[model samples]
Target: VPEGLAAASAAVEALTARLAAAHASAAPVITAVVPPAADPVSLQTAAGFSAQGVEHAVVTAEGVEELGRAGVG
Candidate 1:
């Protein structure tokens, strides 16, 4: 109910969609970056993919640290 909230929400939805598309487009790279047993990351990614049109299996992250480490490295 705030000004620009709708725009922000639309931006987020678009961003999430783009993220999913990018993930699908670069699936092998994404898979390579993902660590095993990374539930949190996996779940997040899965949700993102699902939000788009991707339906694939992936491992999950334990926490943000796991994701950060993988991202940095």
Candidate 2:
């Protein structure tokens, strides 16, 4: 192993854990939708929400394909 590499790895792990905790402290908003059936504006709005730190969920019959059709996940 390279000299000081273990220290560097520990530092990175600590930083990652700190960041994860900070992010987790803020509960994300949840936006749900019926997939392939959405309009462009709605998709755009969901995108906007994500940009502003919210999360989204797609609802449908079995669901995954609908999300693909709507161009979102």
Candidate 3:
């Protein structure tokens, strides 16, 4: 039991280090805004939206226009 627990602990530490290394080389973060429109897919595509470790938001129609005015549409 002790040996099994020790092996598991070493495996966990190795996996943790591997994950950290992968994160360090990960892609840049994206800022995605999904507006509340009739077609969410079209809205997202039109805005060139994507994801993963990003600033994701779903604002109203008026809010979308406001973001546009703020230079972030």
10 residues in a row with least lDDT, candidate 2: 55-64
- Across residues 1-73, which tens digit of lDDT does each residue of candidate 1 receive? 3665667656655655665566557665534443346679886776565544323423322232244334221
Candidate 2, residue 63: lDDT? 44
Model 2, residue 2: displacement in angstroms?
Answer: 3.7
TM-score of each: 0.35, 0.39, 0.36
User: What lDDT would each prediction earn against the true structure?
Assistant: 0.50, 0.48, 0.47
What TM-score does structure 3 among the candidates reach?
0.36
**Cα-based RMSD of candidate 3:** 16.6
Model 1 clash pairs are 38-60, 38-61, 39-60, 39-61, 40-61, 41-61
lDDT of 2 by residue, 1-73 (tens): 3666668656655655665454445534333323344889878877776554443232222243433234221
lDDT of 3 at 18: 63
Model 2 regions lying over 4 Å from their true place: 1-3, 29-51, 55-73
TM-score pick, better of 1 and 3: 3
For residues 2-58, could you state the per-residue lDDT of candidate 3 as single tens digits? 645667656655655665455444423334444557597777674665542332332
Residue 47, model 3, lDDT? 64
Better of 2 and 3 by TM-score: 2
| Candidate 2 backbone collisions, by pair | none
